[PDB]
Structures are given as structure tokens and as C-alpha cells.
Amino acid sequence: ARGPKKHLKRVAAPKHWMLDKLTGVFAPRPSTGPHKLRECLPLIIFLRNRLKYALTGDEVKKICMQRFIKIDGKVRTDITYPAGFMDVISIDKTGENFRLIYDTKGRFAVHRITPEEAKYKLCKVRKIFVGTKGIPHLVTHDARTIRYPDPLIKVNDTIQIDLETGKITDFIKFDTGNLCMVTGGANLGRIGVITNRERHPGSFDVVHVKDANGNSFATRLSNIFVIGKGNKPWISLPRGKGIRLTIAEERDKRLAAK
Amino acid sequence: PVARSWVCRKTYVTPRRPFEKSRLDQELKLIGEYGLRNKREVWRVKFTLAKIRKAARELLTLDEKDPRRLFEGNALLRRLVRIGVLDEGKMKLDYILGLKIEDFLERRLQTQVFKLGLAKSIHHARVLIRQRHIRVRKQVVNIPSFIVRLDSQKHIDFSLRSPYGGGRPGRVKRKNAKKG
RNA sequence: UACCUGGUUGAUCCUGCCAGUAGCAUAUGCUUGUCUCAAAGAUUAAGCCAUGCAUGUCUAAGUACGCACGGCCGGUACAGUGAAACUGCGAAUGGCUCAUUAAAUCAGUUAUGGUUCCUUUGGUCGCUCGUACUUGGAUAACUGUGGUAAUUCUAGAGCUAAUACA
RNA sequence: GCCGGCGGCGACGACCCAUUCGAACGUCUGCCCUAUCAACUUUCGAUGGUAGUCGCCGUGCCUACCAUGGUGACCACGGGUGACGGGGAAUCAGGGUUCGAUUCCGGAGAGGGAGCCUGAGAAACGGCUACCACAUCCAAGGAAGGCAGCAGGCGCGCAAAUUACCCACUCCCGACCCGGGGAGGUAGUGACGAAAAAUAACAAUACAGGACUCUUUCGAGGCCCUGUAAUUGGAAUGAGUCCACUUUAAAUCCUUUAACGAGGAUCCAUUGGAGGGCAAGUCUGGUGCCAGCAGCCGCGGUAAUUCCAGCUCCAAUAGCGUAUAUUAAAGUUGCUGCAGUUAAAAAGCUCGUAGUUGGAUCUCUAGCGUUUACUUUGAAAAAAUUAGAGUGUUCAAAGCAGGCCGCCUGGAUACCGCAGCUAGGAAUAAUGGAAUAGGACCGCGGUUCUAUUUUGUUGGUUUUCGGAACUGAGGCCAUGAUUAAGAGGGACGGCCG
RNA sequence: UUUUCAUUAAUCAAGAACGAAAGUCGGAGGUUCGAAGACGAUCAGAUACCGUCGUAGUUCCGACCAUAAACGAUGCCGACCGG
RNA sequence: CACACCGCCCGUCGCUACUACCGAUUGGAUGGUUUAGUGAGGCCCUCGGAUCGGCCCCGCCGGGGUGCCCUGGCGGAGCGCUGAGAAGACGGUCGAACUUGACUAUCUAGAGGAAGUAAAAGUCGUAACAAGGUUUCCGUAGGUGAACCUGCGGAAGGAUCAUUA
């Protein structure tokens, strides 16, 4: 069609939001921002559907327009603003801080953090370039362009940024025997340790990840995010420890709890 | 575009040959025994049984160590133990094929209301249920085709409001009491 | 539920089709108590349309000398609500329909190291060695005189704004 | 506010880079019927080359000058399509066949073509400009058109609803918490179709009723059944009427609940059949090969099991006929899986290109190994749909919820042709590794050039080491050709017709 | 056949060779038989069967034509299965 | 043939109904390709300059600086020299559309011509099924109201699986 699309049909929305069929015809339609439309989360969904604070669409803008909600220590009134992976949502009214981490089954989970941990965030560097009198530059997965990076930071490494400033505190290299998390494909939300990468020139690089419970799986390089140094994570994990336990013991656990 | 679902399903299959003695008899025996309204209700239970049997048959063909067969098999058997057409002893997938229409028609609320001695005939039970006299747990049901769960069996009581149970005279008794 | 049954002969065994049997959709007939869910001018004519409506929009924050309102304080440029109009943005989304279209459309897979991109989100914005304590002209709105049988037609005259135009 | 200058919190802006939403051009593989379409394209660009032009860029996109190419029985080109393409739908043993205008994705067009302004984005039509076809007003000078948006009307036809109410929900747009939206929501019409489910149940009477016990029979019972009783009896009740709520933007419907409401419970169940196929009457009136029935075979000509009726019975049941497209039946399109002596069918006969099929045999040193097909694994692959886990919608079709006395939960999982990526296997099937030996493997002679270490650094000559093609010889390989098909060609020998 | 070549094969859209009798063009020759036609019989009628005659043809040389119950109504190549 | 040879059955010609084919009318109708000629409208280029400002020079003149310069009012004209700029015009390009011939898709009335199928009490014969009273059938050729008859060469699906040293 002519020009860009403005709407989004409800059934055409990405599955990990878990919008039901009958509520309406349209969906939230995440607006342009740091994270991709397919792999983000509108605040209207997070507030209304996940935290169960707002009932209707009006209550969400009535919350947001009173400027009670910050994303990465910055006030956002846009109810369809895309907050994606590693983004820290802060409610300073009720003093509640959330980090958006994918759960085992492959969706953003309502994972609370201490206010002391809502100071920094981890970020995967997309590229590294230099320009105009050679001040080198870095670009990350949440589109934060940072000047004068540490020259030890190469492409596909992770960096820890203080949210109040815009400067790198510490960084993790992408090497063998490092804790990573999958952010795309069948294995989305699984945490594990790198074993090796198999470089395919002129094509996608494939990496092999071993889980804590002896489960080994492969994934594309683009869908990898280093979260810890060695085996120890630099952030809190969700309810489960990123362990994909199968339907058999899912049933056994559920029936055991009953 | 409208915010409506069009997910609707047929619950009965008509017979291939419309007029056939031996068959018509067998269906009329089932109606007569369990006071069913019409032959749709017999075909409904045949269709549901057939689908359970087809699920069991297509599970058997997979190998005995397959995770999918194990999980699906256990879930099917659990549900058929839950509804009360099997027991813990006979809880093998092979035995699913050895069920029949009688086993499923026994679990109708109409049948159980008759078998527990609330009603004094198979025809009386269907009326009594439909008239809002019967209730399971604390829920007043008026659905003859309510398939009763094994654990939910031990309490089918008269709905408290009911004249028969609750203790409130109806139109006939009220009218006879006023003209008495 | 991996199914068949009538029909060529005086009778028989075949080839073979016609007829029956069940499902699904469009029409249509007669019948029609309760309750939930629910398709619906596609086929023929992407044939033709009276009438009404379907795209508009203001925050403390671009332009307020409409008394249209009452309010201070009375030598306080501008108390405020705010029609109108200039300015900004939207109107390229949505909805409808299936005429076209046969390696075309389209689907799965890869490429832009061969290109553009409003907007959002980051970066950048005394890095340049050469009236400023704020420069210039107009035009709406408004008032006043009009033309045409006629339209969301507009000419002439008198003022006045900028995040308009310089 | 701080000692006439210096400042904090925003909002509008902004050249350029990154990002998000895209968009546009491409890459590989995949589509229905037609030979009564066999050669097509290149005058006027067809295929490629060099240089430009134009464009946001790559490019015959276009111009100039050259070359003579490019596609095609592996079906080009041309014609047809009651053809928008997919996700899907119906049917169904396994294989398949048929449909997919229609709610999600992509494409296209606003009566037919063409041209353009504005803008980041349009060749926009609820923007403009012209022509073609239709048509509105008119003072005849001129003016104004676009429902394949929602209603509604005409036409067309076998075929399809209200000139309704609201931005409250889901979202979109704007300077914007505040405005607007026939997107969308809610009613009305609605037997397109799908789920649940009324039209009675129980008790008491008599049977020249049935079974069970006693008597050899007759004839004896609160043991269990029975109806064509308008016989007898109170008990239960939704359909309707109609308060009050709840529901809702406001209402409606439903659920909830006062009052009324069942004895031909006249508060009445229909649509098709009753010779066979095929469940049900050789019962009684009427008609007389006339009227009609009959999908097919057949029934009717004065005793009609079949017509028009009465009575009775059967089938499915709030539904059941009839017509027509389509699927199974059809192993009557046959890949699985059919036929071809006589039922329909092997060319009169031989050669022959394309096509298909094809005899034994051979047990790893950052680069490889001779390359595939085949098979197993891995990542990638939109939801909805389909299968399928969990969950008492009061059950179910559904829905994605819910459950416990502020809490503990769920929103799984599988499949996803083909082709393209990834790592194992090496049976099976193609292909080749050395035949006038320029064949492998080893150390040996020289020609040209170069690496950019070196004579602490620096300028001129000559070098080696690091690395190539060309060669004049040499040693070694257990040096190199599998067999010769009751496959086939050819040779020769004596006949034969 | 104690010879040779060493997979060169099988079956075949397109495209080819041949193809009875009759039939059509030109030349040669015409014995017999004989479509057409002329008569004589039989017959209700016979335009046929039977008989007498007879043109084209039947025969040869050079061009065409491409069909038959062109039949074993039975495609070709290869293996196995009784006397 | 089975109603059983008093059987079955073939064609011409005859009446009726329903289909289709051929056909002079160089038949109309609608739509698509195009030879040739014309060319609305935009867009581009080269011009064009209706109008609208500014710079200027004096006439009547205030104040400051020191006859001259800056500073305030106004009117005149210089083809003076700078900017803006509408109508219109040559040329270029995209190009709807129009006039005339040609090619071609479908439907469409048609004098008259010549078929097929169904209708079963029409008429003339009896071709076939028996050795069907001339065995039947195939290919080709000629001739008859009609089935058919005849020549030449085949076939048995014949009425002969056989005929003798």
C-alpha cells in the first residue's frame, strides 16, 4: 500500500502478548522506538494485562499522563511505547521496579527487582564504528549510541550501562564458557553456558549452548545475549532458572503441587 | 472485520444406510433403556466414542518409548478414569478399544439420578432434572446430557428451592391449599 | 465402519453404464415452542445512483486590541474562558470490492557491500578565526462598498500579528 | 534565586550519523487447460559489450556506436480461463479429488484510459487537469459530477438485512488526559449453518392382559412389566402475561425473582413414504391405459399391495422434502490400483532422434576427501485454523480463563509439502581419478622476479632465507588396462532356403 | 568357434523405408476373364442371381495413392514354470 | 428367435416435435490489435514582461557634525540600474482521444440447401439373422426408387479343424 501502516489487527499481533480474540478487532500497535515491533511490549499491555492495574484503555493513559512511570530512569507518557529486553520499568509512586526478562516458555514475565538493581542494565553491542575526527562509536540492541567506548569492546560483546548517566561501568566478552540467554527462535528464554561457535562465512554463525541440567541445544549468533561472566549471572533470573523442563515433569510438578 | 469467532463443530454422524433392521432395533433399545429423546443423542455418544477410539488407535502405532505417545496416552486414560468409564486396574491404552456405548450412557445425569433412587423411573429422572429439582455440589443443573465426574457422584441432591426437597409448595399445592 | 443394493435374460455368468445410498454448499417448498453462537447484493451487471452521514484537530507552552462574557487596579504592554482566521500536523492509515493479472501476483529462502525513509529512541549542535537588550515588508481575521439566476464563487477599500514570509 | 552579569526544569526547532516503522528493486525453487498454437523475439530494443543520459540507486530504463545474439518437445511463443495468490475449506482407510470473491497476510482499482500539484510517503480519486461514455441545475450567458465506504434505491437475476443508536469497549488521528472516527461496538431483519433442549411424569381402578409361585387342570397374589380408558386422583412445572432488579453509553436479550398461568394438560408436531431397491397395509370407498404416480425397474385397460381419498403403520423430528455444483461410493481415470483374443480397445510393418530404463565386479593432513542424489540430526520458519495439554461455559458448540482463606496459577505442546542453509552414515544409484604416459611419490641443475628481517640509524652494488611458472637428467612404484554376460556388434567356416 | 571390440543395450514423440487388391496420369500391348453398358431368360416386379456379348480394367515400363477381417481380431525385449 | 419363423428386422418416401450443420446477404452488433494522418491536457526548455517594490536627483525646507556629509516630510521623471513577477508564444516530451484502410475474438436475422435423434396402425419391397432360400463380412471402383447388386484381392467372426497310392 501507499506510505507506512498505522493500525495492527488483534490476531496479527505477536503471540507472546497473549491477547484474546473477542476483546476487540485491533491491538496496541507498538510505536516506533529502540526495540522492534515484533520483539517489544507496549506499556498498555504491561499495565492493563500483566500488572492488572488498569481495566480499560482510558485508565492506562490516566496512569501514564500523571507521569508516575519511568523506563530506564526517563519519564514516558506514550502508552504504546516499546519497552523490550533488559529495559527497567520504574513505578516511583508505589516504589516497584521491573526488568523485562523472557521466561522459559518464551514471553516477557512480571519479574520484580530491588530498587538498588534498577540503577544499571546489560546491553549487546550491534556494531562499532568511528567517525569525524575519530571518536569511535558503539551502537547497542536498544539503540543507545555511546561515544568513546573501551577499545576491548568488540561486536557481539555485552556492556553494563548506569541508567542515570550514559557510560559503560563494565563489559563481558563473547567467549567459550560464558552464561548466555536466547532472544529468538524455538529456544527463546533458555539460559545456558556457551560450548562453541561454528563460523559459516557468508551465512549465519551457529553456537552450541549447554543448559545447567545437562541439556545441549544450538541457536543462531544474532539470537544470543551474554548475561554472566563464567557461570555467575550479573542480573537476577526469573522464577525458574531459565531451565526448559519438559511437559512430562511440567505435569509431575503441577500434580505434585496439587 | 468483526471481533467474533466462527469455531462451530458438528457433534453427530448420520448412518450410511438410512433404513436397516438390526441397527434401528439396537438404537431403539438404547433409547428405551436410557429414556433418550431422539436418535441424534445415540449418534452423539457413538461420534464421541469413535473419536476417543480413533485417538487411541492412532496413538498405538507410535513406539512404546516415545514421549508424545506416553504424555498423550496418560492424559487420555486420566480423563477416562476421571469421567468414570474405567478403573485404576484397567488403565492401559489397549483397553480403551474394549469400551462401548453402554459405558458412556451410564454416566448421564438422567441415568445416575435414576440409579441413585431420587427418581422412580428413567423417564421421571429426565423431567425431574429438566424441572430444576436436581443439583450437583451447590449447582442447580437442568441438562440430562450432563456427564457426571467420578468424584462428583457422591452428592446429587435435590435443589433446595424445590418442592420435593427444599420445602416450598408449588402452583398446584398453593392453588389446592387456597381452595382447600 | 477400508461396506454396497435395483435395472439387459425364458433363466445363467460377465463387461458396462443408468438408478439408489451418505456428506457439503446455493436456491427453494411446506412447517416453525424455548435458549446460546452466528453467515448475509460474491456469482448475473468492477452496471447506474436521489438523499443523509463516513477526517478532522489546542496544550501552562506558535499568532488573541471579536466586550461574545463578567473580573480586578484603576496611569500597571499582556488578568482568564475563547468564536473566527493565519500557522503546524493529519487526510498515502482505515473501509470496500476481485475487473485486471499465468514465472506475473503470491509462498518459503537469501541480498541491498546497489537505495530512500515522516516519526520515535540515542549521538551531534560555542570543533569554523571572519540593532544583537531582538532587524524588514505584507496579508488574513475584523470593519465597509459590491457583482452573478446560480456553487464550500470572490474583486475593490481601511487597519493589525508570527515558530507564516524574509 | 547567587555575588551588572551568571543559572535550574521543560516545550518547539535543527545539517548529519545510528535506530524503529517500513517501502522499492532484485536471488534460488514452486501454478490450472490448450498442439484444431511448433518455432518465437530483433524494422519501432530483441540478447550481450563500451560511453553516457535519466533515476533515490543496480540494470536496455533510455540515447549513441558496435557485436548477432537470447528462448524452444525438460513444451518456448500464442490462445482460454464461469484465475486475484497464499494461510485455509469440504470430503476421506492408505493414496487422492474438489473448492478457496469472503473477516489474517501480500497484490490490485475507484465508470474507462492518460497527465500531474503538494508531501517523508500518492501517479491519491470522499485531490486536481483533459479526453471518452453517462448524467444534474440553468435566466441558455455558464456552473457542478463519481457508493467496488455505512444505510437506502433502481436495474440484473434462482440468489442476499435497517435511509436505526453510540464513541462506553478494541484501537487510530491531532497542536491533544479534554476533540473527532458508519474503523469498530450495540440493537433491528435473519430456519446460511452450528451447540444444548419442551410438547408430559407418577399413583389408584378392570383386563375371557403378560412373566414368576401353588394345583396334573379349573382356579389362586400389594413379586415384576403392559396399552387405542375423552376412567379416578392430586403433585411438578416451563411456554406466555407482568412488578422489581441486574445487564447496558442508553436500552434490549439472558440470568435472578414477587403476582398470574395445565385435563381432549384444544398450551393440539410437522415434512415425506407404506410392490422391490428401502423401514411400513394383498385394509376399505372412488377412477377405469382417462386422471395421475414412478430418481430406476415399473403401476394404471372394472376385484389397483404403487393413482385421488378415509383409516392404520413406518422414517427422521423442530425440523423434513425438492432442484442444482461438488466429494465418497468409482479398483467406472487405476502412483498405491483398472483394461486392450471374442465385451470399447495393440499402430499394416520395420528403422530412428528426444524421452524413460539399463549386466557381474573395486575392504584425512588452518585446508581436505571425487562430486552429487538418498537417509538421520540441528536452526529457521506470523497468528487464526487443524490435532492436542490444562480449565464444571450450569453441560455442550465455545471461551482463555480461573482456583484458595491479600494469596498459589495458566495462557502448553505437535504438525508446517518442496526448495534453500547445518552435521553424521556410505548400503543402494549416477560420475571419474594413470594408455601416443606432459602418470604418482622422492631428493637433485639452471632463467626471470620478488619478501621487505639483515651489516647501531642512513645512501650505492652483490647475496641468502621466506615464495612462484619454465625446464636438463635421475631413483622408486609388486609401475598403470578386472572379467570376458546362456547382453550386444563384427570376423571367419561349411551349409540352408 | 579355447577369434576379435568391451557395455557399444531395450523400447521409442519428431523424422524416415517399404506397403495386397482396387484407383488416377503419361507410354507399350491387348490372350483370357470382365466393373459400366447392350441383349436373352426367370419373376407379380429383377434395375440382380442364370446365360451370350462387351468398354475401362486385368499384363509390362516410368510417376502418384498409403488403405484391407493389412488377423494369430493377441505390441516388442528379458527371466522362471509339466510331460 | 424366447409372445419362440404367423418370429425378428433393413432402407427410401410420408406426417409431427426437437437439435445442429452449410449458405448468397462482400449482413449487422460489441470489443481488442494496429498502417497512415490529426493532437486535448499537464510537465520540461527558450523566450515573454501585464503589474509590484528598492536604489537613486532635485524643489520647498528643521537639528547635529564641520561650502560639504549623516539625519525627518513630500512630488517629478530619467528605454537611468537591480530584484520580484501573471497572461501569452516557438520547441521538446509523456500522451488520452479522434478520421480513414487492414487484421481478428464472440454473439447475431437470413431466401434456399442438406443431415441426425425420438415418435410406431403410414407406403413400397424383403437386404440380415437357418446354407436366411445368391454363405456373410472387410478394402476399393462403377451402377440402381430403396434396401442393395457386380468386378478385383483378402478374412472365417463358415456351412470344412479331417478325404485316403
From Swiss-Prot, chain A:
**Its domain of life?**
Eukaryota
Q: Where in the cell is it found?
A: Cytoplasm; Nucleus, Nucleolus
Example of a GO MF term = structural constituent of ribosome
> Do you know which Pfam families this protein is assigned to?
40S_S4_C, KOW, Ribosomal_S4e, RS4NT
Among InterPro entries, the record links this protein to: KOW (IPR005824), Rib_uL2_dom2 (IPR014722), Ribosomal_eS4 (IPR000876), Ribosomal_eS4_C (IPR032277), Ribosomal_eS4_central_region (IPR013845), Ribosomal_eS4_central_sf (IPR038237), Ribosomal_eS4_KOW (IPR041982), Ribosomal_eS4_N (IPR013843)
BP-aspect Gene Ontology terms: cytoplasmic translation; positive regulation of cell population proliferation; positive regulation of translation; ribosomal small subunit biogenesis; translation
Ordered alphabetically, the record's keywords are: Acetylation, Cytoplasm, Isopeptide bond, Nucleus, Ribonucleoprotein, Ribosomal protein, RNA-binding, rRNA-binding, Ubl conjugation
Which spans are transmembrane here? none
Modified residue N6-acetyllysine is at which positions? 232
Domain annotation S4 RNA-binding: ranges: 41-103
A single GO CC term for this protein reads: small ribosomal subunit
CDD domains recorded for this chain? KOW_RPS4 (cd06087), S4 (cd00165)
Glycyl lysine isopeptide (Lys-Gly) (interchain with G-Cter in SUMO2) cross-link: located at 229
> Assembly and interactions?
Component of the small ribosomal subunit. Part of the small subunit (SSU) processome, composed of more than 70 proteins and the RNA chaperone small nucleolar RNA (snoRNA) U3. Identified in a IGF2BP1-dependent mRNP granule complex containing untranslated mRNAs.
Function summary: Component of the small ribosomal subunit. The ribosome is a large ribonucleoprotein complex responsible for the synthesis of proteins in the cell. Part of the small subunit (SSU) processome, first precursor of the small eukaryotic ribosomal subunit. During the assembly of the SSU processome in the nucleolus, many ribosome biogenesis factors, an RNA chaperone and ribosomal proteins associate with the nascent pre-rRNA and work in concert to generate RNA folding, modifications, rearrangements and cleavage as well as targeted degradation of pre-ribosomal RNA by the RNA exosome.
| Record family assignment | Belongs to the eukaryotic ribosomal protein eS4 family.
The entry's protein name is Small ribosomal subunit protein eS4, X isoform
Organism field: Homo sapiens (Human)
Upper classification of the source organism reads: Eukaryota, Metazoa, Chordata, Craniata, Vertebrata
Curated annotation (Swiss-Prot), chain B:
Please provide the Gene Ontology terms (biological process) for this protein. cytoplasmic translation; positive regulation of cell population proliferation; ribosomal small subunit biogenesis; translation
Pfam families attached to this UniProt entry:
Ribosomal_S4, S4
User: SMART domains annotated for this entry?
Assistant: Ribosomal_S4 (SM01390), S4 (SM00363)
**S4 RNA-binding domain: from which residue to which, for each copy?**
107-180
Is Phosphoprotein set as a keyword in this record? yes
Which CDD domains does the annotation name? Answer: S4 (cd00165)
Q: Which residues carry this modification: Phosphoserine?
A: 152, 162
Q: Which family does it belong to?
A: Belongs to the universal ribosomal protein uS4 family.
Assembly and oligomerization: Component of the small ribosomal subunit. Identified in a IGF2BP1-dependent mRNP granule complex containing untranslated mRNAs. Part of the small subunit (SSU) processome, composed of more than 70 proteins and the RNA chaperone small nucleolar RNA (snoRNA) U3.
Question: Under what name is this protein listed?
Answer: Small ribosomal subunit protein uS4
Q: Name the species this protein comes from.
A: Homo sapiens
- Recall the taxonomic lineage recorded for the source organism: Eukaryota, Metazoa, Chordata, Craniata, Vertebrata
